[PDB]
Ligand binder design. Structure first.
Ligand SMILES: Cc1cc2nc3c(=O)[nH]c(=O)nc-3n(C[C@H](O)[C@H](O)[C@H](O)COP(=O)(O)OP(=O)(O)OC[C@H]3O[C@@H](n4cnc5c(N)ncnc54)[C@H](O)[C@@H]3O)c2cc1C
Ligand code: NA
Ligand code: NA
Length: 423
């Protein structure tokens, strides 16, 4: 349905663009170019060095059902070889609790998980399809808490929240269920609860660096795109060092930001302007009284505690002078954004409360994170519209907004974009 000779420009060398290149290439499309703005590849899979080891500034983990990432590893020769994840739960005062052994709440949560599992198996069949082009059940378009409440499954949120809100994906009072359950589908949720999780000694970034290297055309880096225009059935890309024509455009970069350097048509401007995102802040810390295990703080995942540390990552157990990363959110639709400065102070105060006082913050990053749309915009058919635009003036839309903000979902989506439109 697209000719193998086509000149394909892929924008972004994160997992989504690297995966697009991989699957295009494996389908016989040999004339692609990946254009990356930064010096590096892997995007939010970002694994810097410190004292001879890599720590994670972005993505850390996967699950055994990450079949597309397995396919990437098969190609690169990478293996799941990182340290085992373990965790404890803390209250906002730093006291350790065991929600699994709460004899009142515990059964109520697991009862609701049971009930939800059966709904997902029957009534909501299809919910877990990659992407949103297969229109989900209307109930899944509601905020996750409303969806649960409609089904009498509210207590399930106690399980689902920990790998969601603390992972920067926002809050169940407003995030549509369709996103929550495509990421944490039942089998995935069960893997998280069991601790059956993948990590990489050399960082999530490594396998993407290795993927890039296996490509017939590794990414061009430090490419500053000033304008894209799409006349006469072609794509013209202007950069600070060259300007070139392509036949096809694949976008794995933020679509609202794309409006600012493109000849965005009426629909693009209208719809991509509706995209909202998360401000997810990570601090790479050196600490005293080194933790012995990672910690989750459900109390700090409430919208009323916005900006507090929700989780910290104990990566290298053997070395107390290694990096502990902390995670917090700076935005919520119903509260004013928290400033970088007040959040940083909460890093210091919370880690102190938890008994792991910060000696040094060596790196901090607020990521552009989990692009999505509101329940109202989802219900109003945002994905029917945008997916209906696929191919218009030879432009295809992919990346996080089109699926979910995790590395397996975006790579899966890229794989399928090829099947759907190209082959
Ligand atoms: C702190 C943190 C924790 C996370 N935890 C996990 C996890 O445990 N499991 C999981 O599966 N995922 C996790 N993620 C999410 C995961 O990293 C992302 O979903 C994944 O990297 C998305 O890939 P992508 O290619 O769509 O986007 P990105 O990774 O954001 O990559 C986009 C690329 O496009 C480039 N780009 C942007 N604009 C332009 C432009 N103007 N021109 C050219 N290039 C451009 C960027 O530089 C980047 O290389 C985590 C992320 C973070 C930050
Ligand atoms: Na860099
Ligand atoms: Na549990």
């Amino acid at each position: 349905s697209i000719s193998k000779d086509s000149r394909i420009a892929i924008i972004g060398a994160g997992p989504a663009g690297l995966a697009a290149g991989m699957y295009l290439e494996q389908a016989g499309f040999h004339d692609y170019t990946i254009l990356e703005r930064t010096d590096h590849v892997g995007g939010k899979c970002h694994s810097p060095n410190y004292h001879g080891r890599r720590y994670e500034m972005g993505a850390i983990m996967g699950v055994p059902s990450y079949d597309t990432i397995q396919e990437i590893m098969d190609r690169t020769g990478d293996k799941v070889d990182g340290p085992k994840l373990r965790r404890e739960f803390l209250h906002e005062d730093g006291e350790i609790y065991v929600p699994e052994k709460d004899p009142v709440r515990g059964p109520q949560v697991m009862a609701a998980v049971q009930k939800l599992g059966q709904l997902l198996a029957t009534k909501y069949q299809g919910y877990d399809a990659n992407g949103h082009y297969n229109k989900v059940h209307e109930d899944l378009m509601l905020p996750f808490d409303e969806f649960l409440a409609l089904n009498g499954c509210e207590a399930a949120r106690d399980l689902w929240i920990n790998p969601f809100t603390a992972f920067g994906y926002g809050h169940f009072d407003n995030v549509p269920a369709a996103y929550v359950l495509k990421y944490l589908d039942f089998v995935t949720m069960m893997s998280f609860a069991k601790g059956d999780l993948w990590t990489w000694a050399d960082g999530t970034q490594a396998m993407f660096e290795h993927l890039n290297a296996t490509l017939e055309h590794p990414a061009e880096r430090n490419v500053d795109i000033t304008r894209i225009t799409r006349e006469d059935g072609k794509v013209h890309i202007h950069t600070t060092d060259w300007d070139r024509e392509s036949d096809v455009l694949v976008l794995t970069v933020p679509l609202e930001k794309f409006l600012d350097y493109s000849d965005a048509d009426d629909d693009e401007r209208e719809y991509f302007s509706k995209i909202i995102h998360q401000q997810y802040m990570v601090d790479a810390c050196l600490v005293k009284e080194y933790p012995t295990i990672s910690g989750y703080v459900p109390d700090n995942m409430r919208p009323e505690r916005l900006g507090h540390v929700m989780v910290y990552y104990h990566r290298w157990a053997d070395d107390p002078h290694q990096i502990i990363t902390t995670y917090l959110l700076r935005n919520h639709p119903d509260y004013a954004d928290k400033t970088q400065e007040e959040c940083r102070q909460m890093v210091l105060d919370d880690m102190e409360t938890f008994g792991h006082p910060v000696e040094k913050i060596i790196e901090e990053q607020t990521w552009y994170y989990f692009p999505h749309v509101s329940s109202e915009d989802y219900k109003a058919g945002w994905y029917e519209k945008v997916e209906g635009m696929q191919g218009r003036r030879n432009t295809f839309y992919a990346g996080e907004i089109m699926s979910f903000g995790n590395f397996d979902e975006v790579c899966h989506y890229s794989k399928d974009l090829v099947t759907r439109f190209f082959v």
